[PDB]
Amino acid sequence: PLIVPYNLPLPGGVVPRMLITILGTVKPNANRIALDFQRGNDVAFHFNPRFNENNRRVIVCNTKLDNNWGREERQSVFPFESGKPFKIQVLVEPDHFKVAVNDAHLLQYNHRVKKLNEISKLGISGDIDLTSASYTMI
Ligand SMILES: CO[C@@H]1[C@@H](n2cc(-c3cc(F)c(F)c(F)c3)nn2)[C@@H](O)[C@@H](CO)O[C@H]1C(=O)N(c1cc(Cl)cc(Cl)c1)[C@H]1CCCC[C@@H]1O
């Protein structure tokens, strides 16, 4: 177990077939979670569960380039619950990031940042108890 916020290095960046697993528990009164796949100051992929945006639960995904957020991709399917243990898996594929939560497919996010081998850090933040963050190649 680790204290959030936490940076996981991705040395040499990411590559297709790399599977990143984040295990934790959502805090009881959670408002937000974020994963930030970083290329320097750019965020190639921001994955952001919001537990109370205008009293709805939503997943927001985006990219930050030159310190500016781009066009959001939103999903209403919301597999997290306050207080419960979760597993987020991010599978890097040639054209997208694929996300599964608790072994169920959630979403795809097309690569906007093309330099996968420069996406060299994963920041983990928000209302969680972080158990582990690791990766392997499938
Ligand atoms: C709060 O800002 C968020 C960003 N955001 C979150 C976090 C964060 C930090 C943590 F430490 C953490 F633990 C955590 F879980 C999340 N950091 N940064 C991204 O989450 C971004 C992702 O697009 O959104 C921002 C956003 O809230 N807006 C927005 C604003 C602009 Cl300037 C530009 C666009 Cl494009 C959006 C909203 C505007 C009003 C209509 C809705 C819109 O969604």
UniProtKB/Swiss-Prot annotation:
Chain positions with Phosphoserine modification: S76
Task: Show where the Galectin domain sits.
Answer: 6-136
Location in the cell: Cytoplasm; Nucleus; Secreted
Name the organs or tissues of expression.
A major expression is found in the colonic epithelium. It is also abundant in the activated macrophages. Expressed in fetal membranes.
Give UniProt keywords alphabetically. Acetylation, Cytoplasm, Differentiation, Disulfide bond, IgE-binding protein, Immunity, Innate immunity, Lectin, mRNA processing, mRNA splicing, Nucleus, Phosphoprotein, Repeat, Secreted, Spliceosome
Residues spanning the signal sequence? none
Entry protein name: Galectin-3
Motif, Nuclear export signal: chain positions? 114-129
Say yes or no: keyword Aminoacyl-tRNA synthetase present. no
Q: Which organism is it from?
A: Homo sapiens (Human)
One molecular function GO term is: laminin binding
Q: Does the keyword Oxidoreductase apply?
A: no
